[PDB]
Design a protein around this ligand. Structure first.
Ligand SMILES: Nc1ncnc2c1ncn2[C@@H]1O[C@H](COP(=O)(O)OP(=O)(O)O)[C@@H](O)[C@H]1O
Ligand SMILES: [Mg+2]
Length: 288
C-alpha cells in the first residue's frame, strides 16, 4: 500500500483535468492517471462539500480494500491522505469501464452476461467467506462492477462495506434489500438480494426503479420478472433485454434459469434467500 502526495496524484492526472474524469458522483470523482508508467484510477473524495461522509467512505474503503485480495475484486494500489487537501484511493485501472455503461454485433450475448454473473458471484463468495471475517459490500449494483481488458468483472467501491466481527424507488434504492433500506440491517443476505436485482437488470435491460401503476400500486422489477418467469419461456422472452440476441432455445433457457436464480436471491425474507455459494453452484451448473 503506497502512500502518495497531492503533487504526485496531480501530476498523474494532468492536474485533475476534466478530460481525465472516468466516473463521478456527489461524493467522489474518479480520474484516469499514469504514475513508472502504471495506469491507475484516482478516486478523489469530495472533502470540500461533504467532509463527514467523505471521511467515512474513504476510511471504510481504505481499511476494507487494503485487506482483501481476489481476482474478482478491484485492487487498491495506494492512497493519498492530507486532511483538508486530498483524500483519494489509487486503484488498478479497469479499461472497459463499469457494467452500468455496458448495459445502458454487441458482445453482450446471453453467455457473456452469464459469465459476468459468475465472475461477480465469485467476488461475493470471497467477500462473504474467503477472508477471516465476512465482509458485506452493501452497494452491489452494475455501476460498482468494473470490466478488465479481458472483460472480466470485478466488484468495486467498498465505501459502504461492513466487516462482521413513473418510478417507485429511484437511484440506488431499487438494489437494496428491504431490511437494509428500511432498518439498515446488515447481513450477507443483503448482498444476495442486490446480486439478484443486478442479474435481473443485466438480463432485462431495466433499472430496478419499478413503476407506479394507475391505481398507485408499485410494480417492482422483481414482480415483473416473477410474472414473466411464471409464464414459461415465452413469458421470459418478452421481458429480456431487446438489444440482446435471443435466438436459440439454449440462450432463452439459460436466461430463464438466471432469472429464476435471481428471484430466489431477491426473496423478501432474508432467510428465504440462498447463500452466495449455493448461487455460485447454480450458475456454474448452467455454465457447462
Ligand atoms: N478502478 C477503476 N477503473 C476504471 N474506472 C473506475 C474505477 N473505479 C471507478 N471507476 C469509474 O468511476 C465510477 C464511480 O466509481 P465509484 O468507486 O462507484 O465512486 P462512487 O462511490 O462515488 O460511486 C464507476 O462506476 C466507474 O465508472
Ligand atoms: Mg459509492
Amino acid at each position: 500500500l503506497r502512500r502518495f502526495s497531492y503533487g504526485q496524484l496531480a501530476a498523474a492526472t494532468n492536474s485533475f483535468d476534466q478530460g481525465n474524469v472516468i466516473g463521478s458522483s456527489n461524493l467522489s470523482t474518479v480520474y484516469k492517471g499514469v504514475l513508472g508508467g502504471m495506469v491507475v484510477a484516482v478516486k478523489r473524495l469530495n472533502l470540500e462539500q461533504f467532509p463527514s461522509k467523505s471521511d467515512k467512505c474513504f476510511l471504510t474503503e481504505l481499511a476494507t480494500l487494503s485487506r482483501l485480495r481476489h481476482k474478482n475484486l478491484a485492487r487498491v494500489v495506494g492512497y493519498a491522505w492530507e486532511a483538508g487537501k486530498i483524500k483519494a484511493l489509487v486503484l488498478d485501472y479497469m479499461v472497459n469501464g463499469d457494467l452500468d455503461g455496458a448495459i445502458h454485433p454487441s458482445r453482450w450475448t446471453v453467455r457473456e452476461r452469464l459469465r459476468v454473473c459468475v465472475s461477480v458471484a465469485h467476488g461475493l463468495v470471497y467477500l462473504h467467506s474467503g477472508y477471516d471475517f465476512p465482509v458485506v459490500h452493501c452497494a452491489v449494483k452494475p455501476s460498482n462492477v468494473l470490466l478488465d481488458g479481458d472483460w472480466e468483472a470485478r466488484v468495486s467501491d467498498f465505501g459502504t462495506a461492513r466487516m462482521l466481527g413513473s418510478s417507485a424507488f429511484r437511484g440506488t434504492v431499487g438494489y437494496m434489500a428491504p431490511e437494509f433500506a428500511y432498518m439498515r440491517t446488515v447481513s450477507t443476505k443483503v448482498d444476495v438480494f442486490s446480486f439478484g436485482v443486478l442479474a435481473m437488470e443485466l438480463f432485462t435491460g431495466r433499472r430496478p426503479t419499478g413503476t407506479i401503476e394507475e391505481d398507485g400500486v408499485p410494480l417492482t422489477l422483481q414482480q415483473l420478472v416473477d410474472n414473466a418467469v411464471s409464464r414459461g419461456l415465452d413469458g421470459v422472452h418478452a421481458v429480456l433485454d431487446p438489444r440482446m440476441k435471443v435466438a436459440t432455445e439454449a440462450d432463452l433457457s439459460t436466461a430463464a434459469d438466471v432469472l429464476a436464480v435471481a428471484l430466489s436471491c431477491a426473496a423478501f425474507e432474508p432467510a428465504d434467500r440462498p447463500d452466495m455459494g449455493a448461487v455460485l453452484s447454480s450458475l456454474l451448473k448452467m455454465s457447462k
